[PDB]
Amino acid sequence: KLVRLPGLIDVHVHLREPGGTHKEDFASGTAAALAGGITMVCAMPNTRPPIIDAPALALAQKLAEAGARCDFALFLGASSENAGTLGTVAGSAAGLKLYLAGVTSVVQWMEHFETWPSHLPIVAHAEQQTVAAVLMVAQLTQRSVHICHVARKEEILLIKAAKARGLPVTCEVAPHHLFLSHDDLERLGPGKGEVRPELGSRQDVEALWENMAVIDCFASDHAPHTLEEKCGSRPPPGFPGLETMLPLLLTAVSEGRLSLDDLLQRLHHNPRRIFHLPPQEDTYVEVDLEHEWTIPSHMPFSKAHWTPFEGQKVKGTVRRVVLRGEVAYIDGQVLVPPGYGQDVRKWPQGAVPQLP
Amino acid sequence: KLVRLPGLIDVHVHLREPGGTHKEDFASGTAAALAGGITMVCAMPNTRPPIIDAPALALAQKLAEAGARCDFALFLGASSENAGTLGTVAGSAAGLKLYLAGVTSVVQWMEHFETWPSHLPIVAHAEQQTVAAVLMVAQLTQRSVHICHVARKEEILLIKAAKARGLPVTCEVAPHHLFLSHDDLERLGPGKGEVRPELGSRQDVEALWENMAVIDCFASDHAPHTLEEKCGSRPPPGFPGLETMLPLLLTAVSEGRLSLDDLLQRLHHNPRRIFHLPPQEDTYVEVDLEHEWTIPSHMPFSKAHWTPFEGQKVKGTVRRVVLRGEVAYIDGQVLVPPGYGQDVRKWPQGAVPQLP
C-alpha cells in the first residue's frame, strides 16, 4: 500500500538560526523537513548574523551540526563587501546566494560571478526583468545560474526562451506558486498573504503548470515567521512550507497533473545534479497515496505555527522516513535527535569535483 | 594531482554474452568498463539468444551475476511477438530497447509503447526520420522516450525542436560521433569503419558539439567485434569504446570544449535520473588530467582487440577505481574478480518507483 521514494531534497529553506530562533531553528526546521519527506536541506544565508563571511559560516556550521535532524548544506550570501574573499570557504557551502530583490548594482553582480569559483553553484532571487538581467550577467561571465522561486508567466517563458537558445540556466518553483493565487488573498489577508515573490494570477499559476517541462526543481522556500509577525504592523514576507510541500504535490500526482517521475526529478535528481549533492546511504521515504485529509491551521513541527494552505484537501501523506539506516520519522513523531544531521559538503562524495 | 569523480555510468553497451563470447563476455567487457572509469553498465539485449523473453533474461542475469566485475542492469528487447508479455519481468530490466534500424511496423512500436509499463524506460535505436517517427509514437501514447546514439545534425536539431515544445525526450551521443568523421574513413577502411549509425560529416560532428546542451547522456555504444570480423567478408557494424570514452572526453575537457560538470552530467547524473539507477556506495574514480598518451592499436581489456581511435592523442587517464569499498582497478590492472558485480535492479534503491 505504501510507495517507497528516495530521500527528497529541498534546496531552498530558511531555518533562521542564528538570530531568529523564535521563528524556527535547525532542530525545529529539520523536524518539519523530515515530516515532509525531506532528508536533505540547503539553508539560506539571510540569518542574523548573515552568512556572508567565514566566521559566520563557521558559527552556522556548528549550530547546524548540533541542531539539525536531517542532512544539510549551508549557502553563503553575496554582499557588497565580500566578492573575492570567499575562495577558501566557497567549496564548503551549498553555493552562493545572490539576493536581487547587500548588493545594489549589476556591477556587484558581475564581480561575484567573476570571483566565485566557476565550478560552484550560484542561485539568484530574481523577479520579473531581474531574471533577464542576471541571465545577461551569467552570459557575460560565461557560466551557469539557477533562478529561485519562479512565480510568473513572464519569468517561466523567459527561462524557456533561454533554454531554447542553449543557455545554462535552471530554475525552481515553490508550492505556493503552483497551488495558491490571487484568488486566495481574500482568505489569507494582506499580512499572512505577504510573500516574495508575491502570489500570482490564475494565469501565472496556469503558465507554470503548462510549462512544467521548464521547471527543474521544486523547493519550498520555507520562510517561517510567527503568526504575530505575519499579522503585525510590518508583516515580513514568507510562508512555511516544508510540511505541506510533498502532500500538495502528491495530490497533484494522484490527479494526473504530473507523474511520480516528474515529481522525483524535481525533488531528488535535479537538486542532486545542479548542486552536486551526494547520495544518502540507507535513506528512503514511505508515503501513503490513498489517505485524504484537510490541511489544519498549523502543521505540527514548524515554529511558524501557521500555514497558508489551511483548508486545502490533500491526498497523500508521509508515513515513515529512514535516514542513514535510522528511523527518523513515523506518523507524526520525529525520532532522531537534534544533531543527528550532518553537513553533506564534509562527506568525501559531497565535495564538488573540480580541475586541480 | 588526481581528480576524484563519482562512479560513471555507461547506459549503452553490448557485452555479447550469451552467444557471442569470442567478441566479449561479461568478465572482459566489465574489465574494459572499469579501466575506462565506468562502474555501472546497462547491457543491450541483442545477444544469442536475444533477451526478448523471461527465460532468456533469467539466463543472462545469472551469467552477468557470475561474470560481471562492475555493477549492471540488463535491457529487454522489443520483438514482433513479446508485446504485452513482459509485465512480470519488466521492472527487473534496465528498460526496453526498440531496435528501429524483430519489429517492422510502426503499429508494433505503438503496441510496445502501450503495453510496456508506463513508468519504465524505453530506448530506441532510431536514425534520421525514424527519430521523428518514434517521437510521434511516444506522443500518441503520451509517454517519454530516450533516443540512442544521435549522430547527425538532422537528428540533434529535431530533438532540439521537440525539447523546445516541452516533449519528454532525452538522448545520448557516442564518442565516435564526436571525435571521428568521414575524414577518418580513409584510415579506418570500409570494414573497420562500419558502424551504425555511420560516421557523420564534419558538419554533423560540429553540430553535435554546438548543440551539447541538447545531449543528455554520453554512452559508448560498446559494440565489440573481432578484427577478423570487422575486416572480413561481411563486416558487422560497431566499435569498441569503453576503454577510450573517458580519455577522449577528458581531453575535450582539458581543451575547454566542455566543462568537467558538463561531462559528469552526461556520464553520471543524467544516466541515473533517466534510467532510475541507484547510487553506488563507497564508489569513485581517480583520473590524472595531465598525462599525455597516444591511443594504441588495441586497448588491453576488450576482446575486440582493436580500436578506431588508434593514433589519436589524448590527455587524461584513469588511475584508480574503487567499487563499493574495494579497489577494482589500478594503472592497467583489474583487481575485482568476475562475479563481483551485481544487478542494480535487485537493490531496494534500484527498483523504479511506481504508483501502487
Ligand SMILES: O=C(O)c1[nH]c(=O)[nH]c(=O)c1F
Ligand atoms: O527570508 C525570508 O523571510 C524571505 N521571505 C520571502 O517571502 N521571500 C524572500 O526572498 C525571503 F528571503
Ligand SMILES: O=C(O)c1[nH]c(=O)[nH]c(=O)c1F
Ligand atoms: O550489436 C552491434 O554490434 C551493433 N553495432 C552497431 O554499430 N550499431 C547497432 O545498432 C548494433 F546493435
Ligand SMILES: [Zn+2]
Ligand atoms: Zn527569495
Ligand SMILES: [Zn+2]
Ligand atoms: Zn528564500
Ligand SMILES: [Zn+2]
Ligand atoms: Zn544501436
Ligand SMILES: [Zn+2]
Ligand atoms: Zn547498441
